[PDB]
Structures are given as C-alpha cells and as structure tokens.
Ligand binder design. Sequence first.
Ligand SMILES: [Zn+2]
Length: 42
Amino acid sequence: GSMAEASPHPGRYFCHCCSVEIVPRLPDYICPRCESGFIEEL
Ligand SMILES: [Zn+2]
C-alpha cells in the first residue's frame, strides 16, 4: 500500500494556504504554489 512510502507512495496533498490539491516539493515538503508547508497528505 502507501504505508512506509513504497512504490504506490502518497503524493496527493492539500494545501491549507491555497486550499487546493498539490504535489509537494519533496526535498522541502512545501507547497509548489505558495511554498508554505501547510499541506495535508490525502
Ligand atoms: Zn499553497
């Protein structure tokens, strides 16, 4: 599954600042739009 990352690992995030679904910059774990960090792993 998506536990322990694995191949079908998570990626669909939801930024609280943009209130939209995003794919985070993994090296930073931030938003690709506002670069905040306030995101939810869906
Ligand atoms: Zn954002």
